[PDB]
Amino acid sequence: GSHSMRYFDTAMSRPGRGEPRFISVGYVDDTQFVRFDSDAASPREEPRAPWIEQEGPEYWDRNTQIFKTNTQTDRCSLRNLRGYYNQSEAGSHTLQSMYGCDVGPDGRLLRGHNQYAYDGKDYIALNEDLRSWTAADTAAQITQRKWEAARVAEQDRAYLEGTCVEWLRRYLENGKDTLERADPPKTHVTHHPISDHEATLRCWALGFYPAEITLTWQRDGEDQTQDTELVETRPAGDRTFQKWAAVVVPSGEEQRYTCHVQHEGLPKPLTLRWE
């Protein structure tokens, strides 16, 4: 199927407690393959996926250099941003970044990404064209003018269309037994009386990968979107995910409800009922 590579970076200032922490985590789909934390005491011991170790030490060296330089760049960014919002030297602030590529089953580029958020608010994004910016406010317009003058989008484009696609295809090949394997959900329905009058039906999906899934209840073949409690998909810690969806049903009407499960590892979508 389709795949993504994405880096999620967080820089957090902490006045009076040293320089801002920088952490960068890289993923293929829902699998983390790299981490760099400026607060790690042993950079050499920082986790790397096995299909990464195979690339050898010069790959590690080149990635370590970029992460180290990125630490300093995100600290420069935080100093500038404090100024662009007239903020005091006393507060802690957060700069987040996501960058990477989406490819289709053929490994062709679907789109690239490079965007930022400051204190939880979208700040600037590279547009889908990989040539122009969208700035959220007059602060981000400063960044945009700076990046336009320096031709930064051309550098980001070259990474997204070249390096990112090329290395995602190499990781998918090296890690094909895991990264290209979808594990279907193990599914069942439980029944929890709430009173004489009603019960909860809960439809469970366990042990699936990747995390994307659709889990829904129908009453007499009508979607029950409003009446369904859907919990956030959650990691089990063994690479796989879990989810459930619950509806409250009148006593004796359980057989009118069907749970519907769509997932990439299923040869066909499931329909389930209580018992």
Binding site: I66, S97, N114
Partner: peptide, 8 residues
């Protein structure tokens, strides 16, 4: 593979 970043 990581990307060089640019100061905001």
């Amino acid at each position: 593979f990581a990307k060089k970043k640019y100061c905001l």
